[PDB]
Amino acid sequence: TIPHLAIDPFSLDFFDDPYPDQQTLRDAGPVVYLDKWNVYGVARYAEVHAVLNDPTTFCSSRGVGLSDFKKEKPWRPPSLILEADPPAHTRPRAVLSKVLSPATMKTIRDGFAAAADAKVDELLQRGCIDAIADLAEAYPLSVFPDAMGLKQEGREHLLPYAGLVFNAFGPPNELRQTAIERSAPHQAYVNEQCQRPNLAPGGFGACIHAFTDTGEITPDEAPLLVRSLLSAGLDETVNGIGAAVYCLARFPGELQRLRSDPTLARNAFEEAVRFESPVQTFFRTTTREVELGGAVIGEGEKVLMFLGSANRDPRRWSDPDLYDITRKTSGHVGFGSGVHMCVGQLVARLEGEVMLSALARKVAAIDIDGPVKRRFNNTLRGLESLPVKLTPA
Ligand code: HEM
Ligand SMILES: [Cl-]
């Protein structure tokens, strides 16, 4: 009663144009089996949302990648937050919630906004820039590592470690194996910077250690929690910002709208997160036999949630493939949903908004002026290079 499909959602051919295959996955049925990897898939909005919000049956403590931690050893010690279920998840989640709090956003908003304005003006002096290297990547690298309190030495390891994390959620294909193999220098840099003497006071990493006084986390838990913030955050925001510029380049009406009302910058970024879904997929593992979309799934089965597909499901979204900066994005699952919803979402929206605000106020046109290249990752969708010509306002 369950349709078996041969689509490999982690194949380069898939990454290059996933949307036809995502309609095939949605329309085949509410639950599919992927014979290439022996996992269940859900690609419609309603089932993805249901799985995300049913953590006791669809757990994360057995890994949110293909690998099942009950069967194989994780390639690194499990995240205390992403790879945990309630109640073990609860206290590290509260710490990160507070470290990346609304109140915290007040402390960094002016520095983050200033860097974004400065960068767009710098790029407007240039003309043809790569919207990935020069902007999507350059801007987050100029604000987040400082906000973490990271030292200068070794930052060259930061993007490699992020790309490795998200490749590692994937199946054991060449992308994953290449990433994991000879990754020890990236792991060694990160693990060393998770130690308290290495984190500048007042930054995110030092504030995590300062919570060890409260009884919420123990001193030995703090370095792994800091690791979360050296794992998440950078790559997804990079891809999301690069996607926004791309959409603003491909939908010029929406740039003109945003120019006429820069207070749309925040929803413009949220809509870019829905439209691109920089985090395409996460896994759950079933804790029991469960009925989902009429199919009975056994215990200990991997379930692949297509977040990006769920964000373009026409059963939920009008004109899902159109970028609409006045769309009401509420309910999109590009940040997840339920107990695990992105705890770093205020930092991403902040970086995204202030960059889109900078563009809204200083830029009149964004014209693609060179070969566009995709960046391939088992979990993340984003561009490798986007040559554009910025016309000053
Ligand atoms: C556009 C940017 C981002 C996207 C698309 C994104 C995506 C996601 C998603 C889909 C989840 C839920 C994972 C799951 O349910 O298994 C998640 C959780 C998480 N995110 Fe983000 N994220 C972004 C930015 C950030 C930032 C800026 C940070 C840190 C400052 C961050 C840190 C985390 C952490 C630590 C978790 C684990 C939360 C938990 O398990 O409760 N992310 N992210
Ligand atoms: Cl590590």
Automatic annotation (TrEMBL):
It comes from the Bacteria. Transmembrane segments: none annotated. The keyword Transferase does not apply. Pfam families: p450 (PF00067). One of its GO terms (molecular function) is oxidoreductase activity, acting on paired donors, with incorporation or reduction of molecular oxygen. Keywords: Heme, Iron, Metal-binding, Monooxygenase, Oxidoreductase. InterPro entries: Cyt_P450 (IPR001128), Cyt_P450_B (IPR002397), Cyt_P450_CS (IPR017972), Cyt_P450_sf (IPR036396). Its cofactor is heme. Heme b binds at residues 89, 93, 284, 340, 342. The keyword Aminoacyl-tRNA synthetase does not apply. Belongs to the cytochrome P450 family. This is Cytochrome P450. It comes from Rhodopseudomonas palustris (strain HaA2).
